[PDB]
Design a protein around this nucleic acid. Structure first.
Ligand SMILES: [Mg+2]
Ligand SMILES: [Mg+2]
Ligand SMILES: [Mg+2]
Ligand SMILES: [Mg+2]
Ligand SMILES: [Mg+2]
Ligand SMILES: [Mg+2]
Ligand SMILES: [Mg+2]
Ligand SMILES: [Mg+2]
Ligand SMILES: [Mg+2]
Ligand SMILES: [Mg+2]
Ligand SMILES: [Mg+2]
Ligand SMILES: [Mg+2]
Ligand SMILES: [Mg+2]
Ligand SMILES: [Mg+2]
Ligand SMILES: [Mg+2]
Ligand SMILES: [Mg+2]
Ligand SMILES: [Mg+2]
Ligand SMILES: [Mg+2]
Ligand SMILES: [Mg+2]
Ligand SMILES: [Mg+2]
Ligand SMILES: [Mg+2]
Ligand SMILES: [Mg+2]
Ligand SMILES: [Mg+2]
Ligand SMILES: [Mg+2]
Ligand SMILES: [Mg+2]
Ligand SMILES: [Mg+2]
Ligand SMILES: [Mg+2]
Ligand SMILES: [Mg+2]
Ligand SMILES: [Mg+2]
Ligand SMILES: [Mg+2]
Ligand SMILES: [Mg+2]
Ligand SMILES: [Mg+2]
Ligand SMILES: [Mg+2]
Ligand SMILES: [Mg+2]
Ligand SMILES: [Mg+2]
Ligand SMILES: [Mg+2]
Ligand SMILES: [Mg+2]
Ligand SMILES: [Mg+2]
Ligand SMILES: [Mg+2]
Ligand SMILES: [Mg+2]
Ligand SMILES: [Mg+2]
Ligand SMILES: [Mg+2]
Ligand SMILES: [Mg+2]
Ligand SMILES: [Mg+2]
Ligand SMILES: [Mg+2]
Ligand SMILES: [Mg+2]
Ligand SMILES: [Mg+2]
Ligand SMILES: [Mg+2]
Ligand SMILES: [Mg+2]
Ligand SMILES: [Mg+2]
Ligand SMILES: [Mg+2]
Ligand SMILES: [Mg+2]
Ligand SMILES: [Mg+2]
Ligand SMILES: [Mg+2]
Ligand SMILES: [Mg+2]
Ligand SMILES: [Mg+2]
Ligand SMILES: [Mg+2]
Ligand SMILES: [Mg+2]
Ligand SMILES: [Mg+2]
Ligand SMILES: [Mg+2]
Ligand SMILES: [Mg+2]
Ligand SMILES: [Mg+2]
Ligand SMILES: [Mg+2]
Ligand SMILES: [Mg+2]
Ligand SMILES: [Mg+2]
Ligand SMILES: [Mg+2]
Ligand SMILES: [Mg+2]
Ligand SMILES: [Mg+2]
Ligand SMILES: [Mg+2]
Lengths: 96, 52, 76, 64
RNA sequence: CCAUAGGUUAAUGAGGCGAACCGGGGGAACUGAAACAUCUAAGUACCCCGAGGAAAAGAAAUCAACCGAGAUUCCCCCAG
RNA sequence: UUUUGUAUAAUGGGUCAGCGACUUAUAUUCUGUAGCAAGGUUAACCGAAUAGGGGAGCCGAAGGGAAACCGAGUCUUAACU
RNA sequence: AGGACCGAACCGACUAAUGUUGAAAAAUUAGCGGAUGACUUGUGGCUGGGGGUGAAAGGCCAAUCAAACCGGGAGAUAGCU
RNA sequence: GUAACGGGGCUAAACCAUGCACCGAAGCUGCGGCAGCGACGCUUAUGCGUUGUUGGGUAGGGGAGCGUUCUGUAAGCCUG
RNA sequence: GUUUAUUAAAAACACAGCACUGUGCAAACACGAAAGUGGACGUAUACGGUGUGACGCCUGCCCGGUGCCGGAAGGUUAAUU
RNA sequence: AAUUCCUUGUCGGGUAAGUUCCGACCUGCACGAAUGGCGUAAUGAUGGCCAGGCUGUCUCCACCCGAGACUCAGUGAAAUUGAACUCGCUGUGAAGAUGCAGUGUACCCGCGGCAAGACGGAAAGACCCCGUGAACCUUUACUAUAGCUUGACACUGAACAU
RNA sequence: CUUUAAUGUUUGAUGUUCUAACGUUGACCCGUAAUCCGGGUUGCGGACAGUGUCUGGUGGGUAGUUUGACUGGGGCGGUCUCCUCCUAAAGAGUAACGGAGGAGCACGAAGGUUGGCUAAUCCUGGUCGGACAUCAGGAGGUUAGUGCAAUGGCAUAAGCCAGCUUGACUGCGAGCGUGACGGCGCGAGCAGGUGCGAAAGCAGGUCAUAGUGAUCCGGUGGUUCUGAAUGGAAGGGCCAUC
RNA sequence: CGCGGGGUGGAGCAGCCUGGUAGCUCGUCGGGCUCAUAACCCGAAGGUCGUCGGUUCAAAUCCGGCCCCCGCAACCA
């Protein structure tokens, strides 16, 4: 980023936003990953055990990506609408 | 650049303000214009205030 | 000397010529005055820039008592 | 050793889905009353880095 | 005046040298920043003192997050 | 060699022999090539041991948004044709 | 008597030619100035580098001086050759 | 130093006009050879009967190789 | 008299003399993180600095500027509170 | 005028002739009073000018004496050097040619001399420019800072007044 | 509250005096054979001085630096950004220390719209009144006007009056133009809400092209977006703006 | 921008300093006086007392916004 003596593209442009500390401790879970856990029950701890999310993760989200075949009980976790529907179709359960 | 800049503030009570220029030497009296407040979504009176 | 100055070129002139099929909104002429006047289906900008108000072909023509160049768009 | 990211560049650019970079537009910072509303509005949304200077950005941000 | 300072003996130890490593006391500049002064180089080079086979550190007025961990040092991550 | 251009009266070389200049380490990116493949691979370390263990991690399989948040959508906006 | 005079030693260094890969990294011969003084010389000692010393020329400080020399930072840096 | 046809020389061996010859280059053609790049069709050892075309080159980009010292193959093979 | 040792010996420096100025002695000033030392075992007829430069006749006007010396009524003004 | 640009100012002296010198004038580009002014005996390897004496300084060189140079014997360097079978001229040419073109001249090889050319040798020009080089020096450049100086608190206390 | 007096006592300053810190480069004694140094006695000074921390001033004494580029060499002079014309070779663009000129704004109307209107100059007549005010009429035909330079425009007037007004709106924006990029420009239409008009319609500043400055760093207002155990807050972000 | 202080006849300064109140130095004219410019006196013209609103009977005098002049430190991308 040295453009001769011209103000280089990054110095030209304004800085924007901020880095969220809450974003670093959130995780994103595919439906394909709900099979990898054991017992057919999906908590944060269980996910961690499976080695899907990571240790320093406080919050986790289930996304309609891939597919779930087995009935799965999602516990204390945020689930997107499509993903929820998929889970229901599979024969699963979502409780808060 | 004798024309100073001023801030037209909404009478609606919202923090919304327009900004503009005004020659204060020729026009001592305050500027009043009915402008659109985008927060209330109405055309409200905007009295002149200092840019601060 | 008191002479070394000149302004940056404004890249004016006819951008889309006769028979040239354009999309609506396409600038046909950038100009200073109304050297060309907006005819049928052509809009005139604030800086007298002529632009298509419809998709179709550019049609230059001489019209009117003052014999002025009118740009119209004919639909295809 | 590891390449260091140009930290200013990191502040100003975010890598996107297809591996481009969005940035906030220049000129919407101050001296605004004189700029037309329309212009300001156009400046507001974040825009992709051009094809020309993309390379430079990439060089700046190896971890992106 | 007593005392104290001092003085004469006696005993024990120390002194100096030594590569690097270590702890501490001082501590640059060239250089990079395409100039340069903040900044960088770098607590680096160097100077000095002290020690040991290692040194230093070390047994929470420490973290963590409402669950818990449980002194120090060292390595890989975390993470450019 | 440098040059727009050198027989140049521009540079360099008295000659020979020997030596004399794009390397290495660690990161990153693209290309080839091999492995396995929605998975891939381990690091330190254990292990006399280039085996095997070790998956801590990293990269990938989802993005959008400054962010909360939402999520094959999302941000934008009171709302988007 | 004398920073008196003329003039050897001694101290200097104005002109000159020579020399300029010299006899010599400053000399030679011919002349020249001072020559009891602010003289000169021996031996020893002290002043150290932004420091000394300087009747001052940026002079001199080991044939080196608008900042000595030696080692280190150091393979400084060199958009130049 | 002739020195303002390159020289000798020339009344044409000068100039203008028309024509027919010839010389003249690494241009084009002829014969032989090598290489790149495309086709189409073989029936293959992944290239081949063929068929067009291309092949000056600095900076520079791409491709394919030779040779050197050293390690394995090698207590093999060559070598008084 | 001195000077650019090694291209400049001079009109340059020094000089006796003159003037200003600082300095009362634990001096001013200088070298010293400091102790201390020089000044000076001196003491204003002395010492430092600056300029001028034997001697003779002399050395005129300007204090607005920049310094320096004296003044403190007001304005402004730090740490502190 | 160690100062005067115009300027070799003008007038005078000196000389056959004097941009220098000396004396004046003043029209001081741009002297001037202790970064002293003007005088000044003496002194000076001091600057300028004139005269006498003297002379090879010169007219204009001649001869001689020695040391080299030259030849022989012995020893025995150096700078420099792309390679050379290393001519003139006119032209051409990266624009000044031993090397190219055209042309002229020239048997091969020494030695003593000279120095016009080899843009001869000697030092990566000292001049000039350039480099976001260097250094020293400078100041009312900027930023610092030693020092000097001001106050507050500290070491630092007691009475009595105003 | 304005303004002071009385009786009782807590920080300022300004002296007077004292001694016990401190100073003593005063005298004598001792360690001691010793002009150092220390201890003692004593005189003087004395809470000053002087040192440390903080602080204002001064501070080429010293240091680190600095001191632009273009340029028919460099310096000196001039220039550096933006607009208009020409150079510019009939698309765009196009250089020179080429030839000419301007800008660093202005305007709450000089913006919007509805309704209306048409200029310069000259001649003739007309009180003061004249080459030139104001009034007629003719010729004249935009030679005028454009808030300002130049160019291109402009009667449908973009020129000149009058009424009512804030569209000099907020969110957007198909599609274009122009730039290496940063950017800069034109823009129909859609949503909301407004003004003028009977209505069709027009209005997202001004006839157009100059009138300007990236980033960082900060300032103000709004916004529960964020908020380092949690609730808050601070700070940060986002929108507006300096 | 933050804070402080001022806008007083033609000029500067008192009157604010907690409302009941236009004086000072000149300047100009006129008169007396002088040889007189002057010195000196008498007499007079000349001030929304920055602007405006409020409390109040009464303000230049108290306060609020606003405008200008000055000082202050402060950073200044
Ligand atoms: Mg720049
Ligand atoms: Mg894990
Ligand atoms: Mg902003
Ligand atoms: Mg020892
Ligand atoms: Mg530095
Ligand atoms: Mg430096
Ligand atoms: Mg640098
Ligand atoms: Mg230990
Ligand atoms: Mg517990
Ligand atoms: Mg060469
Ligand atoms: Mg050249
Ligand atoms: Mg050639
Ligand atoms: Mg050559
Ligand atoms: Mg040659
Ligand atoms: Mg060269
Ligand atoms: Mg070589
Ligand atoms: Mg050579
Ligand atoms: Mg690689
Ligand atoms: Mg790969
Ligand atoms: Mg003598
Ligand atoms: Mg003598
Ligand atoms: Mg002699
Ligand atoms: Mg030095
Ligand atoms: Mg000198
Ligand atoms: Mg020497
Ligand atoms: Mg130095
Ligand atoms: Mg270094
Ligand atoms: Mg080097
Ligand atoms: Mg001839
Ligand atoms: Mg042939
Ligand atoms: Mg051929
Ligand atoms: Mg052929
Ligand atoms: Mg080829
Ligand atoms: Mg060919
Ligand atoms: Mg001497
Ligand atoms: Mg000498
Ligand atoms: Mg000399
Ligand atoms: Mg000499
Ligand atoms: Mg003198
Ligand atoms: Mg005087
Ligand atoms: Mg003075
Ligand atoms: Mg004075
Ligand atoms: Mg004073
Ligand atoms: Mg003069
Ligand atoms: Mg004469
Ligand atoms: Mg004379
Ligand atoms: Mg003088
Ligand atoms: Mg003087
Ligand atoms: Mg003198
Ligand atoms: Mg002498
Ligand atoms: Mg040799
Ligand atoms: Mg020639
Ligand atoms: Mg010869
Ligand atoms: Mg020669
Ligand atoms: Mg010779
Ligand atoms: Mg030469
Ligand atoms: Mg050179
Ligand atoms: Mg002393
Ligand atoms: Mg300096
Ligand atoms: Mg230059
Ligand atoms: Mg020039
Ligand atoms: Mg054109
Ligand atoms: Mg053209
Ligand atoms: Mg109209
Ligand atoms: Mg209009
Ligand atoms: Mg207008
Ligand atoms: Mg305009
Ligand atoms: Mg900056
Ligand atoms: Mg909290």
């Amino acid at each position: 980023g040295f453009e001769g003596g011209q103000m280089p593209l990054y110095r030209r442009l304004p800085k924007f936003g901020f880095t969220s500390r809450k974003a670093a401790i959130t995780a994103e879970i595919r439906l394909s990953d709900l099979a990898k856990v054991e017992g057919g029950v999906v908590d944060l701890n269980t996910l961690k055990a499976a080695n899907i999310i990571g240790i320093q993760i406080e919050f986790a989200k289930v996304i309609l990506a891939g597919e779930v075949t087995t009935p799965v009980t999602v516990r204390g976790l945020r689930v997107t609408k499509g993903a929820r529907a998929a889970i229901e179709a599979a024969g699963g359960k979502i409780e808060e | 650049g004798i024309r100073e800049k001023i801030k037209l503030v909404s009478s609606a009570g919202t923090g919304h303000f327009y900004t503009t220029t005004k020659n204060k030497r020729t026009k001592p009296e305050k500027l009043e214009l009915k402008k659109f407040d985008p927060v209330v979504r109405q055309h409200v009176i905007y009295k002149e205030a200092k840019i601060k | 000397t008191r002479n070394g100055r000149d302004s940056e070129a404004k890249r004016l002139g006819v951008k889309r010529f006769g028979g040239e099929s354009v999309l609506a909104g396409s600038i046909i002429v950038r100009q200073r005055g109304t050297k060309f006047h907006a005819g049928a289906n052509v809009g005139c900008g604030r800086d007298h820039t002529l632009f298509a108000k419809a998709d179709g072909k550019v049609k230059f023509e001489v019209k009117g008592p003052k014999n002025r160049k009118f740009i119209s768009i004919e639909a295809e | 050793p590891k390449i260091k990211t140009v930290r200013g560049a990191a502040k100003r650019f975010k890598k996107t889905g297809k591996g481009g970079f969005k940035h906030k537009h220049a000129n919407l910072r101050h001296i605004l009353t004189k700029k037309a509303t329309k212009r300001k509005r156009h400046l507001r949304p974040k825009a992709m880095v051009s094809k020309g200077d993309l390379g430079l950005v990439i060089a700046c941000l190896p971890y992106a």
